Amino acid sequence: VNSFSGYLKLTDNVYIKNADIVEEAKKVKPTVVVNAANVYLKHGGGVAGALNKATNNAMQVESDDYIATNGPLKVGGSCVLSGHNLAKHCLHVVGPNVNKGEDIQLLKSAYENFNQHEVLLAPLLSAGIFGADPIHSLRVCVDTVRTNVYLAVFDKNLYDKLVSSFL
Numbered sequence: 633v634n635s636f637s638g639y640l641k642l643t644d645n646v647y648i649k650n651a652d653i654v655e656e657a658k659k660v661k662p663t664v665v666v667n668a669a670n671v672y673l674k675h676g677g678g679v680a681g682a683l684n685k686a687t688n689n690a691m692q693v694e695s696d697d698y699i700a701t702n703g704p705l706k707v708g709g710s711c712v713l714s715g716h717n718l719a720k721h722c723l724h725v726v727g728p729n730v731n732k733g734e735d736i737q738l739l740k741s742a743y744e745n746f747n748q749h750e751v752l753l754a755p756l757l758s759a760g761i762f763g764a765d766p767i768h769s770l771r772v773c774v775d776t777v778r779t780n781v782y783l784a785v786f787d788k789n790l791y792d793k794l795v796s797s798f799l
């Protein structure tokens with residue numbers, strides 16, 4: 633039993649809700665919140681910009697030190713950093729950004745990072761300003777993640793389409 637509330641159950645382990653991931657994380661304070669990251673951990677917009685703003689830029693400061701030490705992430709890769717005031721940990725995961733011409737096949741690799749954590753709050757990878765089909769991102773999530781994932785969808789219209797088209 634966990635403290636996530638109001639989710640629709642899609643499969644044994646995948647759940648989905650119309651919610652603002654920022655407001656969800658503050659309420660639940662999950663062990664792991666997923667960020668929709670880029671390889672440079674520059675959290676300028678989309679989910680990343682919103683999560684970083686909620687940390688008063690502390691996420692960005694920590695991220696800049698991480699990049700200075702380690703260099704950029706790989707597309708499809710991840711790193712674990714602090715969750716600041718939002719969660720214990722933030723799993724920064726880089727899905728392909730279609731608006732950069734990145735291979736959509738790397739979306740499965742991106743979701744594989746979730747399997748290293750028993751329970752996660754997350755957005756749909758490569759959705760939003762990363763320019764992938766969110767229905768596809770859900771299909772890949774369900775077919776790749778085996779741990780317990782609570783998916784937050786900001787747009788209510790998109791949330792309803794995700795549910796009604798789900799196979």
Ligand SMILES: CC[C@](C)(CO)Nc1ncnc2[nH]ccc12
Nearest residue numbers: 653679755756759760784786787
């Ligand atoms: C619309 C769905 C998605 C593309 C990925 O799930 N964007 C978000 N999901 C959840 N919370 C969010 N806050 C800001 C953006 C955002």
Ligand SMILES: [Cl-]
Nearest residue numbers: 678679760761
């Ligand atoms: Cl977005």
